[PDB]
Design a protein around this ligand. Structure first.
Ligand SMILES: *[C@H](CCCCCC(=O)O)CCC(=O)O
Ligand SMILES: *[C@H](CCCCCC(=O)O)CCC(=O)O
Ligand SMILES: *[C@H](CCCCCC(=O)O)CCC(=O)O
Ligand SMILES: *[C@H](CCCCCC(=O)O)CCC(=O)O
Ligand SMILES: [Zn+2]
Ligand SMILES: [Zn+2]
Ligand SMILES: [Zn+2]
Lengths: 340, 340, 194, 340
């Protein structure tokens, strides 16, 4: 007969024994370097220039495009559930509104600034973050002002961007989050805020490590703007480029970022960790991107995973890697769950 | 009219300018700390005790359970495409084969050892890795020998495990990969190999940082063994436990691991990075788990992403975070793609 | 010892027994507060031999200092060092070097977590601990003297109880703690809600 | 019977044994990284514009407000007991003396400069430190020149501050200690001293890490100036903000601080430690604040502690955390105790 063999072993070394630290439910809470709370959550809003808008964004489950007169009814339950922060993306759909230099970006009658005035009046406890970019406002769908050849014009682009960011702060945004990835733009945005006497009250939250990839699908299907004629890889960093991301992180911190965003999130957890060391004195924010968010919804629907389980696992994953902030489309579900 | 405003800016600081490093296709290859090659790939095999087996594993797309007489025809195209390594999981389905102490684990007529002899004879260039655990062989489906109460018995379990691992090496396994997570088991496995005069030729590849979670779905649906009566969380580390994972990594290295496995992979990239610093002199291996693998297949099918694009992104993600080895169910697709 | 100093061997032998017995009875965690050299090793070994190490958290009072802050405690658990001084085992307040060594020792001997006591007055040691025991949970003990000092100061109008309570306890978290043993827990159960 | 059980134990490991280092009274002195001496002590003086002043400050036990003609009789015993340094706070009570721009701050007939001339003449061995701020001199009680809205005007404030500091040094202050916390003020103060050919002889002692909190009670009851209409939290750092304090420390050192002050002290010992690493080549000074000083007096009176015991414990606490200087209202008691 084949019998079960057992080798002779040495007494247990104390150095081997770890399970004393996670045998009980409350210990797996003890073991966490940061616990997920409600004020960590930032929910993105897509504001349409049609004020009575409320349109489902095809590839962004349970997420819509909303105009100003539909905003209070949509944001009231959330704020009363604990929502503390929003990140605004404008979606101007009126014809003639896009142009080469992204003029509509800071149009005072534009969705973003109108969204800013709305929230400031009806929800003055809400912390307002504004995405800063031209891609949503340009005729060619890119994140800066181009050269005749089509590549990006650094100087005119950052010049255009700093103006927008300052204008968002003038309008009452608490935080500007530049997402263009164009070299040196944080410096010019900070200088712009200084010269406008707004730096003392405006948080600059840089998308310091933003990567090219296959995870931005539903976003383009929402804010309608996908790099027509070209590729946003000559400014988004390559996925394999850890060295460049590390350099980009030190750069944005040195140029004045008050915080940084790592995007996408799950698929870039190691970069989040890198950021936690390089930008150790700054708040780090995870952006759970529409592709990551859609992948979880899809996997659950197919039975591969449980939505709420994998949602808590992924988002606790952000906190483990060093983030203390999360921009996520699952914020409304988390407002519910964190209570129970 | 609202016109496009442009702020005055300072000359460009050289320190701001990074795009000089990734403007061309070959530069995004230059920027990678490690490039994906074919000999990096390890493909898991599930061996059935029915030698004429070839059964689809419900929740593991394009992956099956195979017996010995179906193995050469299945592995021949792969080895001729560049496959260099396999990781064996036994799936004994014969009634009466499971028992309290996991006796069938190292049964010489068992799927693993028979699989070992098969491959050694017909594919002697193939590098053979054997998973080491009792969960596939126990009556209760857990990874070690239990106490009367049902928790795990450290001493008898590691005693049982070291025997199995040594027996796999005696049978001709090149590498043993213990996946039980029971405190101190690497020490006893190494000592067992030493006393058997096999340590000089056996790679010990520890699953040093293995986490509890929602990503192991299809695996249980393959190797038929999901923790009946209980939870494998009292030995798998909690997802939030970075401190414990770091300690577990130092422990397994100090106990003799020649390499370590981080599992799951995408969702634990920050731990892979941690490992790249703590175990800097050792090969680090990523395990793309059946849940992660099924999530990608699902997302693609739903149109959220492109399978091959997100497959290359995720797996290059492993290399970016510090891995130089990948256990993946997409190895057969990668044998194809890496050629073109 | 017959002379009155402490007998290391018999003491740790006695202590490990107690700790194991508390775990046998169903304690989830044992927190040795004696400060006698090497006691964590013997407690861990005792738990191992009793097959309880896999489920018992060892929370060492690794950095416990002598001082003037333990007043009310002795007035509760009735036990103040008759005939002698607990300074030959509690570390001296100025001894940062010894505390750092004591922290590495207890971690190496098997502590799953460590306690720094007292808390406010030793925040720099908490920080030291956050670096040396970075992979372990660190716990602040707000001692009866610190707790009584805050109650007294508030009553006198020097400070507001709830304000200085939140300031001091957020102070623990800033210095590296993720756990707090505190007599103001019942008030905090209330406040954290609002 | 329940008998006393004793487990079998291993021989003592040498690595366990520490008590050899602190078994004797002189060893607990050996064990200290710095010992408390008399020249470490800096005593604050509140100078009134009523020269015959000597008024008890309600909430500052045994501390008073004193005018110039009462100063020599008050400082003579102390200097003869070993006092080596004073920090001056002016308290102008004459009506019409406060104004929007803090004009009276550097009034040559003002309490500070008159206090400077006094001490320089009658106690020329005394080292003179002057607090630098506008809060004691402004109509609204804030530490800088405001915008029309009431927030602080960085530019005009630091411009105003540098002038004051330079003027204090012109008058004969050995050291200026700016306590306003307004971004970049150390740079402009240093530049001001350079242009006045006084940088080679003026110590700049920055309140680099000054926090908002509940510990400044009695101070406002002395120097009569508590932030009417507003909150000094938009410039004092938040208590939880370790990251900001670390950044503020590096900033002030890089801008020219010769030393830094951490305030408050006991409740911020971990920040003192942080400072000891970041500003390792600079003298670090602890400020035992009026609230901390009043809390100790209160606790003793109530019997919670012994004043002198807890005074030595707290102040040795500063030295343990990295300070080699202490600003303290218990300096006169310490001049006595350190002798015996
Ligand atoms: C938009 C900035 C944030 C990333 C969008 C996140 C998401 O929900 O997908 C620019 C990203 C881009 O489209 O390149
Ligand atoms: C099996 C060891 C490797 C993880 C399986 C990876 C996968 O394909 O899902 C034990 C894991 C477990 O089931 O707990
Ligand atoms: C008791 C262990 C914990 C310290 C008591 C904390 C308090 O509430 O005062 C031994 C301390 C001792 O009395 O030496
Ligand atoms: C005064 C500078 C030093 C702090 C006063 C210390 C004390 O004795 O309380 C400005 C502090 C403030 O009132 O904000
Ligand atoms: Zn853009
Ligand atoms: Zn197992
Ligand atoms: Zn001031």
């Amino acid at each position: 007969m084949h019998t079960a063999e057992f080798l002779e072993t040495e007494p247990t070394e104390i150095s081997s024994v770890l399970a004393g630290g996670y045998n009980h439910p409350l210990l797996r809470q003890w073991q966490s370097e940061r616990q997920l709370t409600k004020n960590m959550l930032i929910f993105p809003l897509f504001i349409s220039d049609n004020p009575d808008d409320f349109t489902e964004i095809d590839s962004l489950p349970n997420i819509n495009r909303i105009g100003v007169n539909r905003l209070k009814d949509y944001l009231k339950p959330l704020v009363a559930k604990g929502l503390r922060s929003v990140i605004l993306f404008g979606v101007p759909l009126i014809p003639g509104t896009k142009d080469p230099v992204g003029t509509a970006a800071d149009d005072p009658a534009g969705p973003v600034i109108q969204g800013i005035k709305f929230i400031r009046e009806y929800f003055p406890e809400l912390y307002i973050i504004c995405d800063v970019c031209l891609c949503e406002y340009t005729s060619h769908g890119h994140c800066g002002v181009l050269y005749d050849d089509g590549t990006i014009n650094r100087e005119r682009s950052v010049s255009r961007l700093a103006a927008v960011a300052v204008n968002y702060a003038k309008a009452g945004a608490h935080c500007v989050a530049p997402s263009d990835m164009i070299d040196g733009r944080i410096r010019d945005i900070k200088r712009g805020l200084i010269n406008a006497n707004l730096a003392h009250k405006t948080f600059v939250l840089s998308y310091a490590a933003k990567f090219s990839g296959n995870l931005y699908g539903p976003f383009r299907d929402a804010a309608c703007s996908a790099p027509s004629n070209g590729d946003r890889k000559c400014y988004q960093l390559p996925p394999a480029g850890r060295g460049l991301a590390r350099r980009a992180l030190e750069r944005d911190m040195s140029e004045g970022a008050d915080g940084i965003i790592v995007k996408p999130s799950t698929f870039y957890l190691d970069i989040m960790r890198d950021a936690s060391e390089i930008c150790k004195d700054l708040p780090i924010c995870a952006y759970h991107v529409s592709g990551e968010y859609a992948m979880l919804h899809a996997a659950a629907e197919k039975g591969v995973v449980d939505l709420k389980t994998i949602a808590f696992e992924s988002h606790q994953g952000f906190l483990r890697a060093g983030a203390r902030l999360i921009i996520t489309y699952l914020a409304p579900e988390f407002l519910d769950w964190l209570d129970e």
